[PDB]
Amino acid sequence: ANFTCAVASGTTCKSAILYTSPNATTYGNLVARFNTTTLPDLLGANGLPDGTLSSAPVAANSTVKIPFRCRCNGDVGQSDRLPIYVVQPQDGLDAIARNVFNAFVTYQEIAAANNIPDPNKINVSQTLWIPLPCSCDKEEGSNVMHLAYSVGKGENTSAIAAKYGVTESTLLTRNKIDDPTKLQMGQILDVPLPV
Ligand SMILES: *[C@@H]1O[C@H](CO)[C@@H](O)[C@H](O)[C@H]1NC(C)=O
Numbered sequence: 390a391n392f393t394c395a396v397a398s399g400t401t402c403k404s405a406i407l408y409t410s411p412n413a414t415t416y417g418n419l420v421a422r423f424n425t426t427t428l429p430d431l432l433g434a435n436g437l438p439d440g441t442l443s444s445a446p447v448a449a450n451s452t453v454k455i456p457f458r459c460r461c462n463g464d465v466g467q468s469d470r471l472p473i474y475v476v477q478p479q480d481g482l483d484a485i486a487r488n489v490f491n492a493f494v495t496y497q498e499i500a501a502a503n504n505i506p507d508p509n510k511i512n513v514s515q516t517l518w519i520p521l522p523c524s525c526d527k528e529e530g531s532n533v534m535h536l537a538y539s540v541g542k543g544e545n546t547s548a549i550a551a552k553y554g555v556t557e558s559t560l561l562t563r564n565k566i567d568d569p570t571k572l573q574m575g576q577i578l579d580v581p582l583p584v
Pocket residue numbers: 411412413449450
């Protein structure tokens with residue numbers, strides 16, 4: 390389930406997803422859709438200056454680091470009752486999960502988290518808590534920021550680990566990957582940033 394977290398229940402820390410924006414949008418809109426962080430923190434997480442306007446563009450298909458508060462429940466780490474998603478006229482949990490949130494969650498996880506779904510029957514304008522995966526676990530005794538990462542096509546665990554200043558075996562043990570060569574596009578990795 391989601392990302393694992395083994396520290397005391399109620400533990401709060403800072404995590405992130407590397408978000409792939411389905412459409413052209415702006416930092417201001419992301420701040421709004423997510424509501425998990427303030428604008429200046431979003432800008433800093435993506436290495437942009439103080440004077441940057443909220444209208445700063447994010448191109449379709451490009452990535453944005455989105456920070457949020459993680460809460461651990463004893464088993465798992467989830468974004469802490471945020472972000473909130475309002476169901477649309479022709480939305481389905483699976484389409485929301487996959488087409489809005491990069492499949493960082495499954496429709497089952499969206500189901501369990503909002504208690505009301507036991508099957509997928511939902512109403513428009515209803516608010517859903519989206520439990521983005523996270524953790525506050527340390528990495529071999531050190532403090533890390535956990536980043537949810539969706540594997541790109543043609544990527545390997547070596548280059549992914551290196552890009553995040555992490556050891557490949559760390560990436561592999563943390564994500565219980567027996568065989569690196571089996572890495573799939575769109576597989577969600579828990580990357581423990583040394584930071
Ligand atoms: C960019 O995103 C649009 C959807 O908004 C999609 O139709 C197109 O395939 C994407 N292009 C690339 C280069 O991924």
